[PDB]
Design an enzyme around this catalytic site. Structure first.
Site, short mmCIF file in Angstrom:
data_model
loop_
_atom_site.label_atom_id
_atom_site.label_comp_id
_atom_site.label_asym_id
_atom_site.label_seq_id
_atom_site.Cartn_x
_atom_site.Cartn_y
_atom_site.Cartn_z
N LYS A 1 0.85 -1.19 0.00
CA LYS A 1 0.00 0.00 0.00
C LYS A 1 0.87 1.23 0.00
O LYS A 1 2.05 1.16 0.35
CB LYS A 1 -0.90 0.02 1.23
CG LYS A 1 -2.33 -0.42 0.95
CD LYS A 1 -3.02 0.49 -0.06
CE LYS A 1 -4.53 0.29 -0.02
NZ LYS A 1 -4.98 -0.88 -0.82
N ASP B 1 -6.77 3.98 -5.66
CA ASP B 1 -7.42 3.95 -4.36
C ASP B 1 -8.19 5.26 -4.17
O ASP B 1 -8.82 5.75 -5.10
CB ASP B 1 -6.40 3.78 -3.24
CG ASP B 1 -7.03 3.24 -1.97
OD1 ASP B 1 -6.29 3.04 -0.98
OD2 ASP B 1 -8.25 3.01 -1.95
#
Lengths: 409, 409, 409, 409, 409
Positions: free
Chosen positions: D101, D141
């Protein structure tokens, strides 16, 4: 200039659509042009330097794709022009490739098998700096074949330090080639000839077809159209003359004959006619798979064919285009028509990436599938702009190539 | 063509020596020529495409070395020719480099510092495929400087994934540059001017010198000759006029004046004379560090200088050559004379390779030492062939480049 | 925070000079910070995860340079701050390096030689992604030595697929190390102490010196100052106490004694005094090569030393700085004073690059030569801003690091 | 801390299974954490430094996979936790990926399209050191989309020296994207909703469904459930309110309306109700595709839904879990439920590798096929441990991830 | 020598077909042989050096493929011979692989799991220079398994800097393995046994089968033949003895028994017989899946089996071949018969390339499909040369490998 002329055709469709000025300029000029002067040792011991070219027009949509030519009369201009077309050709078919081309100023006939191979390796070793399976994938063209291509592949592999077999397409089957490579082009024409019949409502079973030329494209186009479409090939021609028959020839027999005898002429059960005559034949579909300018000003006004599937390159001149459109005759653009070849080369490159190979049926279906889409896609744009199918195909290409560049930055 | 012209001069010397025909051919044509069309985003938002060139003539002796130009008037031909020269220039100096050159058709004066930087990075990013610290090492030229060069270096570093600083020479000192870079060229002319004196037996202390032009070359050449050789610079000229004085000017004061005032003209204690007159001055050594053709047919017959050290490029025309040789006037070839620049660029690339930098004195000694050898080496060839020093320099070069290619295969 | 504190000191000098706001921000924040959690198999079979850090503050002037620490009390903040300093330390010495540091939270004393080696390899294998001979060159620090460093070297080499030996400095001599590595730091202090004497006009032969601490720095600093400068080391101290003697100790004998006996205390012919006393000694030069804050508020006002050469890190507190400057006492900044170490490490990296190694004398001269320039350079800045020598060195650093970033873009 | 909380949930399942202590520790800490401070030139000319993060928790089962966020409120902690989840999310779906991430502390809304792009390239250029198609594949995202992703892809390609298009997923279709990317998540919920029905024996044709939220997830989940399952979507809610209808809405119409009008509220033929009410609706399946903690202590006791398919992230709090399990209500874990997204991203990365693209139907079937297995696999574990389905999903993940590490060494 | 013997067999087939002399020589000698002596740290602390081999015979058709052996009795000769076979094995199956083999002179039984893993990594780290997913793909063999193979995979990936999992085949399923790996070999025999029945016209439902040996091959071969072909396995043997039964055993029960009890002997409902007897059994198909020379001169004249499917390696001696051919008994060559293993390993390398994995049925069909073709292809050659099927298989191989090399240059 040959290139400027190509540019002109581009601007035509560029003006038909709202394409940013500053953007159109990049889509015009080619990204890379590499010129090489490499020495090749001849059998007789003396060294001879040869000139080579490799141009990558656009790479926005993906890695540059384009054949290599071996000809005594090759200009950087001719090369640029061809690559320039590649870009639009690949795009119209919707393949993740770019636009590239290359050649070597040399007459293969004056070189020994060995000399030829050597020159081939050296050239490919010279333009290696710019190629790559993810950069530029060369392929065969005028005076180059599976044999030469194979050397390229081998050379790169030994240069890179490991077997690649995806650096070039059109390789021999038992070496990373793809089945259906030969009939590729022809089948493309067949698929197009069928859809053309559809848009015109002509039943294939009753439809009549005339094919100018009997090379790879002509033969396969004619044969497949006959067997798979049921259409009656009432005439075909050689680089000598042509034969007619309202009853319809037996493409298979015709081929064998053209294999046993230089030309299809003299063939019994066929009314001898001139090449110009065949073009003026009263047939549903004309498949000019021979020389350029075949259909020009003079002919144009006399052509009775309802639809023309361009098997060759630029058989119809721009003047003929205007006249044909005016007369309402459907002219399927070569960029779309004989794209079958490039299409199957893509499948080969794919099979090579995963090192797994598909069977004939697979390639056939895939080729046919994509061909149909490409056609319909062009038609859509055609109706949206109410222009010449060829023009349509060009816009569709330019558009797709622009979206890519735009979205990339 | 400018290139063909360069070729001609090469054939002249090639005929003087027994050079294999088939071999000479490779020594003539350039190995690589890359033409790039890259888009650059302008401040106003719109994109503009620029044309760029990079040519690597020969790499036999080592990695290609040559500057990059930023000029609205730049032809592939001009670039090729320049690159062609570089091959012989580096050769004569005995540097392990090759021949290369590049440029971009653009006028820096119409671009914003930002736009310029951007165009600079993009260009260098485009020809990156062909460059490398061990392949091609670009350097400054017309309208490019330490500032631009710095960008190149930074771009490559960030592209390659690590600091390089040897991908380009002529970088700013506190960034991989080399001390003595400025006076490089001049010092070279100084060393030459001195040896010119030696072969003629002229004592430097009493020798008189005239220098046409007062740019980097002229100033430094004049200054160093004056201080280090003791020769009396009785005359210098501006891009306006020239000043004379049998007593000998004070190069330092002259410089300061040319810095505070556009030209050296008007300078008190100096007899104003035309540029043409300076050339006809009765001095021991003439250092034409100005424009080309400065010494031509007309002047030639009247030049009283015993020796001519070409500080500029081609100040003397071929016709002048013949006449000067005939008259017995020594004409030191620019390829050798003003090589000082290229020579110091090599030292910077060396220092960059080992990330260790030498001090002024070092560079100076190194430059002078190699300059001496290069001179004497040409002289040897001169006597062995009994030809013009320029020609000798050309043979020496062609020979050295051939041996390498021969021994390599 | 330790980092914020380092930042403060930087802003101080940043305000003294006209430094672009937006630019200063980048020179503040570190470019890269990599935190690793790697498992190490322990002798007893069970696995244990260790936390590792590696930070590259600035890389503008060249590849990041910085040691690695093995300590149970290591915070990313401590690491960052240290790296931050490195950037200014290398820059003040004019070395083509950047700023980096790293460590592993672990107590070596609780690890078996094997376990330690394993952890060492795994760690270096993990931060390998960011290091490189032209990217990041680690070095020894707290709890790491030539032995550990060697492992690193071997690990990288076996990982990269070929001997490197330039991936880390401080390697064992017969393995890519550099002679003079030990006395490096000390000799730096020596050169500094000498120049400090010069600016003050104090004759070395008669000058008296006191050295707080007898570790690598202290010993070497003391010994060389004694032998090479002729200065009389009237006092030295241990991590216990110190001895005095106006006659001057025999550094050599003193060393031997401190080797045969834990401390230099008890040593006959020496008046035992406390460490605090030594600092207040009436000597020309004070060389605090011990702990930080050694010279603080309380002491400051009582220090009689005319010049202070900081052999250790931050021996003098900021408060003491103000007081000492006020009193007119010369305080040579540690970043410049004990930079000798990093300086010699550079030479090692240089020798490693070309695989050629210099002899002691060479290293010595090189180290002393650069040391002198560094000093003089800071002095110039000192007079230009009329500030504290430490501040001067800080500006000099910040300036040099700015120019590079500016010129790079 | 957000991360510590994530670890806690992990330990819960780790204690339920016999997982080696020392091993568990490595599965807890993340492998790599890269923090970057990169400057971005703003339109107004001034430079601005931004902070970026990239964490690769585990890579045992394959290359790290995880999205990037552009948010003014982003902590390394939030990122770590998120990546930590990815590890188990990918694992439960049985995809050959790892856990990663990243994000940048910045508010997109305050940046110009140009500034945004620039910041995007620089960021990706900075974390490039750690990424790679076989190392780390970023994806979109919060506040990032196909447009941004495209830039990343283009940046890498130009950086690596060749078109990659597999370095990031979620790219625009005509640029390496995958069909079915949008309906991905929804279809996953649909597949889950169906099997949940199956385990409960509820016939879909008669089953009633309520969906809290109408974002990508909600819309598609609802629409597909309606069309493909025949279940009557009796209620949906906006970020304002919700509408009810025992007759069942026309998801298509509802969508259009939500498109023409900010909310689905006001929509005629719909009983307006609050979001909290919707949750308490008496329906067979509740699909919380909105915000977290939607279902908490208060609600839990009142929820009449027989099964809950978590379309969003953590809609149900742990307290709700306990009560729900106690009450015997089936709660399908989000990691399994909304994994459809990650699942299709894998297919894109696969298509990218072989540069061949599948058609919608393929993707659909593929997604559904894997979804089913993933579900059944969790169920098996559920029965083997007799725990909460969410817990089961967590164990199955930890187990699979342990086997790899164990077998790897 | 073992290698020379292998060469002999090759010359046999090479003389049967028109194979260029100078060409055959290349096909005889192996391309690369790498011998390594690597130290491995043993648990007790002391170091021990081991000898390792890796040979790549031919790479013409693709990357070298071959297992690795861990045996105290391993000679470079044994390794070469084996690799030599691989080249023909892969070729007859028509897989894009080459020929390779390797091993380490060591007895696993005397090494600790730790020591063995270490030795495994070191070895693979040493031969890494020659291997690669596109160069050489090792696989398991004698005394090596999924576990060891996994170590190799892990080591390479951590060495190359990114997950590969395609560097070796035979990896654990949840780590890049391929389903159907175990039953691979057996299924191949089954396919073969079926086709053998076809050529002989023997109906499988009524056909009787005897299988010498009950290892992986024997078991699976017997089991599948029974269930999928319906043939009655009237006898199987252990490394002790064999059991007979005209009624036909229950392969499933038989396996369980051999699992619960060391041998299949003692098994109730079975007439105990010697291994030699089983071979002389009066059955339609004999499947020697045990030791070499099982069928020799003595037996040959007595074997009543109509067809022999060589499940093991060289069960029948050349003498037996001659006699069997003479008697007219069909002997399916092992290179073709037990190639199923190699065949399935290729599918694994394929799935690994695209990171997408097929399900059991897929692998099954794929394996059976190619198996059939391979068989038929050999049969064709058999009839074209009127030779022994084994010979046929050898020619077909040599041929294919020739065309490759010939077309490559």
């Amino acid at each position: 200039s040959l290139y400027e002329m190509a540019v002109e055709q581009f601007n035509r469709a560029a003006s038909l659509m709202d394409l940013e000025s500053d953007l159109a300029e990049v889509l015009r000029r080619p990204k890379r042009v590499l010129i090489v002067e490499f020495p090749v040792r001849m059998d007789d011991g003396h060294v001879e330097v040869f000139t080579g070219y490799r141009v990558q027009h656009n790479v926005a949509r993906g890695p540059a794709k384009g054949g290599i030519r071996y000809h005594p009369d090759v200009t950087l201009d001719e090369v640029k022009a061809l690559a320039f077309w590649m870009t639009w050709k690949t795009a119209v078919m919707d393949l993740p490739f770019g636009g590239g081309k290359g050649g070597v100023r040399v007459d293969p006939k004056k070189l020994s098998r060995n000399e030829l191979e050597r020159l081939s390796r050296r050239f490919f070793s010279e333009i290696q700096v710019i190629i790559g399976p993810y950069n530029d994938i060369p392929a065969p063209d005028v005076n180059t074949n599976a044999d030469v291509i194979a050397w390229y592949m081998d050379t790169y592999s030994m240069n890179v330090g490991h077997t690649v077999l995806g650096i070039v397409t059109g390789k021999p089957v038992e070496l990373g080639g793809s089945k259906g490579r030969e009939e590729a082009t022809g089948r493309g024409v067949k698929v197009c000839a069928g859809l053309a019949m559809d848009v015109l409502g002509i039943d294939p079973k009753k439809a009549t077809v005339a094919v100018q030329g009997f090379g790879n494209v002509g033969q396969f186009a004619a044969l497949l159209i006959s067997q798979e479409l049921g259409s009656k090939v009432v005439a075909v021609s050689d680089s000598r003359g042509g034969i007619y028959n309202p009853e319809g020839f037996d493409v298979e027999e015709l081929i064998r004959y053209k294999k046993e005898h230089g030309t299809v002429v003299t063939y019994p059960k066929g009314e001898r006619i001139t090449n110009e005559e065949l073009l003026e034949l009263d047939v549903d579909i004309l498949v000019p798979a021979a020389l350029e300018g075949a259909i020009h000003a003079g002919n144009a006004e006399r052509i009775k064919a309802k639809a023309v599937v361009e098997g060759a390159n630029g058989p119809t001149t721009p003047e003929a285009d205007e006249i044909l459109s005016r007369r309402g005759i459907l002219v399927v653009p070569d960029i779309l028509a004989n794209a079958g070849g490039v299409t199957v080369s893509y499948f080969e490159w794919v099979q090579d990436l995963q090192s797994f190979f598909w069977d004939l049926d697979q390639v056939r279906n895939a080729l046919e599938k994509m061909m149909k889409k490409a056609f319909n896609d062009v038609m859509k744009v055609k109706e949206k702009y109410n222009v010449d199918m060829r023009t349509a195909a060009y816009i569709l290409a330019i558009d797709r190539v622009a979206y890519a560049t735009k979205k990339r930055g």
